[PDB]
């Protein structure tokens, strides 16, 4: 049972940078049996490099592979925004054919502040006895952002959920949605609904609000 130890687990680099991913086998591998695959979110994996160093048809030549024995390398000589993906090594020689743990490649770009928006719960949802308040943080970089919910200046905890879009494959930005979930009774009891955003691209925190309920 050959172990494929892949490193780093994740990396962030700029467009034009040379990036190298390593994979260490627990035993000697014939170089012909080592392959690299790329997997973009919600897409099937794609073969990149076969037999440790051969470029597969349809793969841009910025992708290369090298090594032998127990040490194999995947290199992206000029990182492009579309190269956002998880990369995997695999050995197809000795059953079980377990993959490396993968390397999440993130594209480092210039800081971009989020365009923030708030959405009050709809009248229809209010009929159902639950209020969903949504905060949208649009087209920002880096992905780390702090969203704080304030219900009549009181800082909220344990009643929100967030979702982040996958990095854009062209402009390398992210989008985030934050959803504050309250019962109708709890919603009606309060008036000021605030969403406070902390991000690198912002001089000082940005609060977006409405009143009703």
């Amino acid at each position: 049972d050959i172990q494929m130890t892949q490193s780093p687990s994740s990396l962030s680099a700029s467009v034009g940078d040379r990036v190298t991913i390593t994979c260490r086998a627990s035993q000697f591998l014939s170089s012909f049996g080592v392959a690299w695959y790329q997997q973009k979110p919600g897409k099937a994996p794609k073969l990149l490099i076969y037999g440790a160093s051969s470029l597969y048809s349809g793969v841009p030549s910025r992708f290369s592979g090298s090594g032998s024995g127990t040490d194999f390398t995947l290199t992206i000589s000029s990182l492009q925004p579309e190269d956002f993906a998880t990369y995997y090594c695999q050995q197809g020689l000795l059953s079980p054919l377990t993959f490396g743990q993968g390397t999440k490649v993130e594209i480092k770009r210039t800081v971009a502040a989020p365009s923030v928006f708030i959405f009050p719960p709809s009248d229809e949802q209010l009929k159902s006895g639950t209020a969903s308040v949504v905060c949208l943080l649009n087209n920002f970089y880096p992905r780390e952002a702090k969203v704080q919910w304030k219900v009549d200046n009181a800082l909220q905890s344990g009643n929100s959920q967030e979702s982040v879009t996958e990095q854009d494959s062209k402009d390398s930005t992210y989008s985030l949605s934050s959803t504050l979930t309250l019962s109708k009774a709890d919603y009606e009891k309060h008036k000021v609904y605030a969403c406070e955003v902390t991000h690198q691209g912002l001089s000082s925190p940005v609060t977006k609000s409405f009143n009703r309920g």
Partner: peptide, 16 residues
């Protein structure tokens, strides 16, 4: 899982 002798050619004490 391959046939080492068919891939690499010849007879040998092939591993993987």
């Amino acid at each position: 899982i391959c046939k080492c002798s068919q891939m690499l050619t010849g007879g040998w004490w092939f591993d993987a």
